[PDB]
RNA sequence: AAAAUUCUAA
RNA sequence: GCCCGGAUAGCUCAGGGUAGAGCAGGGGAUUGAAAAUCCCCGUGUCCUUGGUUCGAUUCCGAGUCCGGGCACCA
RNA sequence: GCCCGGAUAGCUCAGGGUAGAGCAGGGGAUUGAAAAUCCCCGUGUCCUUGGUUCGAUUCCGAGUCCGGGCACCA
RNA sequence: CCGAGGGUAGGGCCCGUGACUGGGGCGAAGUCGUAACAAGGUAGCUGUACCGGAAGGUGCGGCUGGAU
RNA sequence: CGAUGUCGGCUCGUCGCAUCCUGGGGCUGAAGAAGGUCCCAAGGGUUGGGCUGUUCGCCCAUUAAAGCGGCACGCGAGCUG
RNA sequence: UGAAAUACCACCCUGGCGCGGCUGGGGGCCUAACCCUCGGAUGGGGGGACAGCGCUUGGCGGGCAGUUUGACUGGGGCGGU
RNA sequence: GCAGUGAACAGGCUCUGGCGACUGUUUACCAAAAACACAGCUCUCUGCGAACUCGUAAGAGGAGGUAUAGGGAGCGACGCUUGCCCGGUGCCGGAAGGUCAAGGGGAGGGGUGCAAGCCCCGAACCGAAGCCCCGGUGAACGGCGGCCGUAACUAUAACGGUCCUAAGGUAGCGAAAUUCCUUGUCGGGUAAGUUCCGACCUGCACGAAAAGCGUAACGACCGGAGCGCUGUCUCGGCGAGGGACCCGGUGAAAUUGAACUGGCCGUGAAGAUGCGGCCUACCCGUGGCAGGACGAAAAGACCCCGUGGAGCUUUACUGCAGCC
RNA sequence: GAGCUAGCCCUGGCCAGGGUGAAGCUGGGGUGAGACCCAGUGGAGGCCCGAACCGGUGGGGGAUGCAAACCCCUCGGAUGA
RNA sequence: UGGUUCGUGGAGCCAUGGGGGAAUCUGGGCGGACCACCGCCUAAGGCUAAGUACUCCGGGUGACCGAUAGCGCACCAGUAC
């Protein structure tokens, strides 16, 4: 449940911030972060090539386990669950009995203090990791490597998961948050359950200042520039698109597939993505 | 089609406006010397209402007064049963073929609405004027299209066009305007 | 278990 | 200016021995109607011309038109 | 102002000597009457001119006025 | 000092009235279609929501004051 | 066209007369008063405001009267803009 | 009785297969090229003769580039020529 | 005491519309806005060695992120809403078919050689993307009509006949940042109101995400009215100082064919100090004003011309990267 | 050539004073328990007033300037995009 | 695809990015598609003086300049600015 605002000031009416609750530990494991490096968009040429970014409040950079197989058969006690300014989800703080700590992403559920562990015969359990194979079929689980030893790579965001629909030979069949029904090798690993903090998709920034606190600077229309600058500049007064509408660099945006068409990929994915 | 024709076919279009427009004027209580005021009116000939322009004889000797000579008695009472229907609250001598109307100096209640009768149909007029106006125009935008007309020319036949049509306003102003200083006198 | 409207007078 | 094609009834059509198919049309059964259903039948050098085989809408030669296909255009 | 159409009865249309259709119009029927239906009946220098054929609404030239397409304004 | 009243400022209620307008009533030999009363020819009524020249149609749920 | 700065207003004017008032006249369908029309006449005069950028024109309240035109639609090395 | 006689041979036609020979297309699996990945690497795991790259083919292709975009004309245009 | 934030520093206000929600941002040096940005709503692409961007590549950015995420596009808090047309165009889907390049295939011809051969040409047929074709697709490009007649009574048409369309503008709004005719008509306010507000609908040419209609609050935005107050005005006066003026010192500039440079009526390349006729006029300054010198200044920026140039557009042409 | 200007990255720095008084906390009331109300506290905000500072609205002046964009009066933000 | 005079032309030769790919004198390339005849020449390794080109430098010489010329610099110039 977000907070809300009495509206005292005009973009203090519908501004709303998280609500907190789930987070114990007010400042990060000093072993575990690192600085982030704020790039505001450009490459190792200093030419933008990603507009719009720069200018977020500084970040330091949090070092996450996403490969939970690194230490099997080994019991960890939820420590404490902090916020991540790298990420949608929460974390959870991992005191492996081993006498290392570790960070992971924080399920949803998942309470402080208890216990979970990788390892094929983990239990089915929440935090717990095994894998894919050794996880029941209709399991909500999220943080799935897509190739073995690859690292989890699929459904790290608040709120959003995965559900195994069934097997077959070496791979099982997974519906991802996208909807689409792809197949994983067996041996990837998986941490059971979804990702916690699922109210992060009903906040509503407020003003544009939130927005530059992210990091993200002001999106200028395709219309407000000149042909110089686009495709869609020009016309005196305001105009309409006028031609299908496009991208700065000239390609069609409403509804021109991009994928890759001979991708080797594409074997692996059963159905594509859904609404 | 054409130019000539298109403007014969105008001034005609604004001239059938405009007489509407008189028809409208007449048929007011106005001096209330007019004879055409009376002229229209549902009466009650053999069970069947029609217009008295197939039943009498309107005439305006007098100003003050007015007749309505008629040429079938017993329609005079039903048309003097007609004359008191529910209007102009006059006062109607009847027979001996006779049958007179005078007329009173029209109160400031009834010159009040009067001027304010004018004036509308007034407007209404010029606004049949300028809708025609307008279809001239799309006459002339096809008509110039049609033909492969020159610029300068079809600049000129609109201005033309506008010469045309504030003829029929002027006198549309003037007669609105003769009629009423005939209720201001 | 049903394809088909309307009606000046004491 | 090459190539691929078709002409079969009123319209549209499938078909070495053979002459068909549908609704339109005419008759008739039923219909107070609209139909719909139902029984009977035509409307043919199967484009011209010419050549094969015992003969041929059926194969080929050459032609006329329309249809599509293609490339080119000092 | 050049290229595809069009004209054929009262309107709208489809069709190498031939004459059609639908419904405006006038009737007849089914109803106690008027309704919408059901049947008939008129209606055509097949737009003017000119040239092919034993003969042309049917082929073609010339137009005329219209649906215009494209090109023109841009 | 208080004080009738005068004046400045800001409010509340009521009445009259207003270009224009929104429906409502009384009329009747109209225009339009024909919803309800028979299962009124789609059983009707109903709260709602949407749409429709108009009465009304339709969706959902309800009522029998619905016929066989 | 190696540039004659273009609408309107303000300021300052000056000229023309096809005269708005004013002064002198003929005729008059001029009783009088007050008008119509033409003739002579440029000396003086020709208000304030609402509207709109407006000149114009409409309207308000006046007056003897609220004249029309020219001067690069007088006048921006004078102002506005 | 057949236009064309039936028995065995012979070269060929309308076809159908049965293999053999050369071609062409599919599908599946495989691993070792090649790609990714595994603090462990002459190895493991994932992909896999696909992807990637080279040559060649046709296309889409104002994202970018070079250009064209006529004259007459009581200015030019527009209409006309 | 005329007067107490006794001097200095320190909001004039109300009523009423338009535009944009708002704080912000912008044309450094003529535009601060209604413009851009903005939270917020929608479409879409992207399963990760992601799509996309930069780069020949390597390698980066995306992101040490992972569909509640990232990109691209439009709209623009919020309130109520956002209709029909998929025929064209775009996109998406479509293991049929039509066309189609290289390559394959080599029927069949040609050159030559005594000849074995050497060499070229070459039909049917197999053969991708693209295209055509079949569908789907509007918060993709976009577009949302005409004419005949019609009721006791006129104009009027709920109805209705009919032509065309891919289909003919629903709600809401409307002389408006849009209305040509236009100062439209009526109402308000004013002694008088082309502006302003309230209406009508004859919308030349509004209209639903280039959003439609409203809305509290906000605005150095753009209108109209009123109170207060005033040199804005009648209509101007006076006073202050710094200049300007005189004296001493120092001492520029653009401009400059030469100058012994008057007014008028004409004439003259059509606007004359300079040419004709006339009138007027002793020589030389200083302070003042700007009508003239078509005064200065800038080889007119408007207009045309040049087979001049540049930026931009696209279904002009031809290519090129990119992608298939 | 980014010693101007634009954005971004790294590291520091600055923002007098005054006004308003959010959530939260406590107490009181309240109810079955709450919702809620109230009181004090607290001190939030692209809130308010207004110097530095950053701007640059309207007006006048300046126009071979003090100045190749300045001066005066007025104004906008002023804990944040 | 380049090169040659050779712009796809009847297009050889020389060169070579891609695919295919021999032979050892009875082997091989060439003589303007091709074929044959007749001739010329021995690819796929390397080196090689001289005659040729230029003028920072040094000398000789001008129907070359004589300080606004002649080098931008006759002079403390790549200086001042
Ligand atoms: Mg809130
Ligand atoms: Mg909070
Ligand atoms: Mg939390
Ligand atoms: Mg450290
Ligand atoms: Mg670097
Ligand atoms: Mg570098
Ligand atoms: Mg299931
Ligand atoms: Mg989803
Ligand atoms: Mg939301
Ligand atoms: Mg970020
Ligand atoms: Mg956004
Ligand atoms: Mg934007
Ligand atoms: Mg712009
Ligand atoms: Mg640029
Ligand atoms: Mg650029
Ligand atoms: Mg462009
Ligand atoms: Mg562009
Ligand atoms: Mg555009
Ligand atoms: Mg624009
Ligand atoms: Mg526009
Ligand atoms: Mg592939
Ligand atoms: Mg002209
Ligand atoms: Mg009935
Ligand atoms: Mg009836
Ligand atoms: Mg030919
Ligand atoms: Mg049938
Ligand atoms: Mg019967
Ligand atoms: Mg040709
Ligand atoms: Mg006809
Ligand atoms: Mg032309
Ligand atoms: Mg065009
Ligand atoms: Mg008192
Ligand atoms: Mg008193
Ligand atoms: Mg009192
Ligand atoms: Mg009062
Ligand atoms: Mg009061
Ligand atoms: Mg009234
Ligand atoms: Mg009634
Ligand atoms: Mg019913
Ligand atoms: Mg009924
Ligand atoms: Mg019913
Ligand atoms: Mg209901
Ligand atoms: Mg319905
Ligand atoms: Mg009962
Ligand atoms: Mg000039
Ligand atoms: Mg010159
Ligand atoms: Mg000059
Ligand atoms: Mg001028
Ligand atoms: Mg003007
Ligand atoms: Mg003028
Ligand atoms: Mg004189
Ligand atoms: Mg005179
Ligand atoms: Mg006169
Ligand atoms: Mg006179
Ligand atoms: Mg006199
Ligand atoms: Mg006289
Ligand atoms: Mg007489
Ligand atoms: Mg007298
Ligand atoms: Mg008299
Ligand atoms: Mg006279
Ligand atoms: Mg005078
Ligand atoms: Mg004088
Ligand atoms: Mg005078
Ligand atoms: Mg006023
Ligand atoms: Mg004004
Ligand atoms: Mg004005
Ligand atoms: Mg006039
Ligand atoms: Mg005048
Ligand atoms: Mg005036
Ligand atoms: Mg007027
Ligand atoms: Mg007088
Ligand atoms: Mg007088
Ligand atoms: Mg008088
Ligand atoms: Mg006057
Ligand atoms: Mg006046
Ligand atoms: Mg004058
Ligand atoms: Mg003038
Ligand atoms: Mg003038
Ligand atoms: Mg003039
Ligand atoms: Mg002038
Ligand atoms: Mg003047
Ligand atoms: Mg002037
Ligand atoms: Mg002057
Ligand atoms: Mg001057
Ligand atoms: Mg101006
Ligand atoms: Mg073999
Ligand atoms: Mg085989
Ligand atoms: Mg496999
Ligand atoms: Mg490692
Ligand atoms: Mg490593
Ligand atoms: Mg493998
Ligand atoms: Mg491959
Ligand atoms: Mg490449
Ligand atoms: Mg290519
Ligand atoms: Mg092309
Ligand atoms: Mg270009
Ligand atoms: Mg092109
Ligand atoms: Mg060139
Ligand atoms: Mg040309
Ligand atoms: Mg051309
Ligand atoms: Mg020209
Ligand atoms: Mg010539
Ligand atoms: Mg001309
Ligand atoms: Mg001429
Ligand atoms: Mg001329
Ligand atoms: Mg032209
Ligand atoms: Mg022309
Ligand atoms: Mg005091
Ligand atoms: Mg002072
Ligand atoms: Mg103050
Ligand atoms: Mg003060
Ligand atoms: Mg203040
Ligand atoms: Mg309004
Ligand atoms: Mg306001
Ligand atoms: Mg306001
Ligand atoms: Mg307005
Ligand atoms: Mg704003
Ligand atoms: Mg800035
Ligand atoms: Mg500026
Ligand atoms: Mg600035
Ligand atoms: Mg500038
Ligand atoms: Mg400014
Ligand atoms: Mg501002
Ligand atoms: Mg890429
Ligand atoms: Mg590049
Ligand atoms: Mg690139
Ligand atoms: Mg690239
Ligand atoms: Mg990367
Ligand atoms: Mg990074
Ligand atoms: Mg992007
Ligand atoms: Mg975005
Ligand atoms: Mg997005
Ligand atoms: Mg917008
Ligand atoms: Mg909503
Ligand atoms: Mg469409
Ligand atoms: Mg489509
Ligand atoms: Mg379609
Ligand atoms: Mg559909
Ligand atoms: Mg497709
Ligand atoms: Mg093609
Ligand atoms: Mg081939
Ligand atoms: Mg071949
Ligand atoms: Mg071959
Ligand atoms: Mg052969
Ligand atoms: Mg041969
Ligand atoms: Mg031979
Ligand atoms: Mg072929
Ligand atoms: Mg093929
Ligand atoms: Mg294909
Ligand atoms: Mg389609
Ligand atoms: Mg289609
Ligand atoms: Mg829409
Ligand atoms: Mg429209
Ligand atoms: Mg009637
Ligand atoms: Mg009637
Ligand atoms: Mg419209
Ligand atoms: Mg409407
Ligand atoms: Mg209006
Ligand atoms: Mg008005
Ligand atoms: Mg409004
Ligand atoms: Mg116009
Ligand atoms: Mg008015
Ligand atoms: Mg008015
Ligand atoms: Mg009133
Ligand atoms: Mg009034
Ligand atoms: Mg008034
Ligand atoms: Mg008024
Ligand atoms: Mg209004
Ligand atoms: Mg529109
Ligand atoms: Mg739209
Ligand atoms: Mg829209
Ligand atoms: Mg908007
Ligand atoms: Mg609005
Ligand atoms: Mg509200
Ligand atoms: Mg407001
Ligand atoms: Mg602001
Ligand atoms: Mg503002
Ligand atoms: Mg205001
Ligand atoms: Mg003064
Ligand atoms: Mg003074
Ligand atoms: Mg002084
Ligand atoms: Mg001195
Ligand atoms: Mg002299
Ligand atoms: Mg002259
Ligand atoms: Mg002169
Ligand atoms: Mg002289
Ligand atoms: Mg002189
Ligand atoms: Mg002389
Ligand atoms: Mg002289
Ligand atoms: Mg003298
Ligand atoms: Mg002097
Ligand atoms: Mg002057
Ligand atoms: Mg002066
Ligand atoms: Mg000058
Ligand atoms: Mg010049
Ligand atoms: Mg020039
Ligand atoms: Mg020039
Ligand atoms: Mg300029
Ligand atoms: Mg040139
Ligand atoms: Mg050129
Ligand atoms: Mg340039
Ligand atoms: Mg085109
Ligand atoms: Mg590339
Ligand atoms: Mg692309
Ligand atoms: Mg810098
Ligand atoms: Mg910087
Ligand atoms: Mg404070
Ligand atoms: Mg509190
Ligand atoms: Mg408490
Ligand atoms: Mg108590
Ligand atoms: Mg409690
Ligand atoms: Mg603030
Ligand atoms: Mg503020
Ligand atoms: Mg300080
Ligand atoms: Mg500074
Ligand atoms: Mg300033
Ligand atoms: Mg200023
Ligand atoms: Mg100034
Ligand atoms: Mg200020
Ligand atoms: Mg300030
Ligand atoms: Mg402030
Ligand atoms: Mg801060
Ligand atoms: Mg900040
Ligand atoms: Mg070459
Ligand atoms: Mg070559
Ligand atoms: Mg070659
Ligand atoms: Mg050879
Ligand atoms: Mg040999
Ligand atoms: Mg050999
Ligand atoms: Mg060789
Ligand atoms: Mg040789
Ligand atoms: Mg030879
Ligand atoms: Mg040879
Ligand atoms: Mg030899
Ligand atoms: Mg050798
Ligand atoms: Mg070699
Ligand atoms: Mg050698
Ligand atoms: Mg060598
Ligand atoms: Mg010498
Ligand atoms: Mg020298
Ligand atoms: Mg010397
Ligand atoms: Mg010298």
Same mark, same amino acid.
């Given at each position: ?14 501004? !709303? ?24 968009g ?6 933008? !090539? ?36 790298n ?26 203090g208890?216990?979970? #562990? ?21 399991? #909500? #689980?999220?943080?799935?490597?897509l ?12 709120? !959003? ?18 909807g ?80 890759k068409?001979?991708?080797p ?11 | ?13 604004? $001239? ?19 004879? @055409? ?8 000939? %053999?069970?069947?209402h ?5 039943? @009498? ?11 309505? $000579?008629?040429?079938?008695?017993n ?23 006779? &049958? %007179? ?35 001239? &125009? ?20 609109? @201005?033309?066009? $506008? ?23």
């Open positions: 449940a977000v907070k809300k605002f009495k509206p005292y000031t005009p973009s203090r009416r519908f501004m !709303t911030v998280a609500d907190f609750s789930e987070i114990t530990k007010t400042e990060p494991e000093k072993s575990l972060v690192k600085p982030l490096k704020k790039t505001g450009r490459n190792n040429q200093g030419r933008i !090539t990603v507009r719009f970014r720069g200018g977020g409040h500084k970040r330091l950079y949090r070092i996450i386990d996403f490969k939970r197989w690194d230490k099997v058969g080994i019991p960890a006690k939820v420590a404490a669950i902090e916020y991540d300014p990420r949608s989800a929460r974390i959870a703080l991992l005191h492996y009995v081993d006498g290392e700590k570790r960070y992971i992403i924080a399920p949803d559920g998942l309470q402080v208890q216990q979970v #562990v990788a390892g094929p015969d983990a239990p089915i359990q929440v935090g717990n990791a095994l894998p894919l194979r050794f996880i029941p079929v209709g399991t #909500v #689980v999220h943080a799935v490597e190739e073995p030893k690859k690292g989890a790579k699929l459904a790290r965001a608040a709120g !959003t998961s995965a559900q195994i629909q069934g097997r077959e030979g070496d791979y099982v069949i997974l519906r991802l948050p996208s689409e029904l792809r197949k994983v090798h067996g041996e990837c690993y998986a941490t059971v359950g979804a990702v916690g903090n699922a109210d992060h998709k009903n906040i509503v920034l407020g003003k544009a200042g939130r927005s530059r606190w992210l990091g993200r600077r002001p999106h200028v229309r395709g219309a407000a520039m000149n042909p110089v600058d686009h495709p869609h500049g020009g016309g005196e007064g305001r105009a309409p698109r006028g031609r299908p509408p496009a991208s700065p660099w000239g390609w069609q945006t409403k509804g021109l597939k991009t994928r068409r001979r991708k990929s594409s074997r692996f994915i059963i159905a594509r993505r859904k609404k | 089609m054409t130019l000539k024709e298109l403007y014969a076919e105008t001034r005609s279009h604004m $001239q059938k406006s405009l007489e509407v427009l008189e028809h409208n004027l007449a048929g007011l209580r106005t001096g209330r010397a007019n004879p @055409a005021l009376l002229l229209h009116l549902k009466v009650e000939y %053999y069970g069947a029609v217009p008295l322009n197939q039943i @009498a004889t309107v005439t305006a000797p007098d100003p003050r007064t007015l007749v309505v $000579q008629s040429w079938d008695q329609a005079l009472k039903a048309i003097e049963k007609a004359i008191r229907d529910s209007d102009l609250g006059l006062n109607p001598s009847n027979k001996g073929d006779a &049958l %007179y109307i005078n007329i009173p100096p029209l109160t400031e209640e009834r010159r009040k609405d009067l001027v304010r009768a004018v004036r509308q149909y007034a407007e209404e007029g010029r606004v049949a004027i300028r809708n025609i106006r307008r279809e001239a &125009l799309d006459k002339l935008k096809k008509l110039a299209k049609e033909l492969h007309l020159s610029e300068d020319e079809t600049k000129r036949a609109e @201005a033309e066009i $506008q010469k045309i049509t504030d003829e029929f306003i002027a006198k549309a102003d003037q007669l609105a305007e003769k009629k009423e200083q005939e209720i201001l006198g």
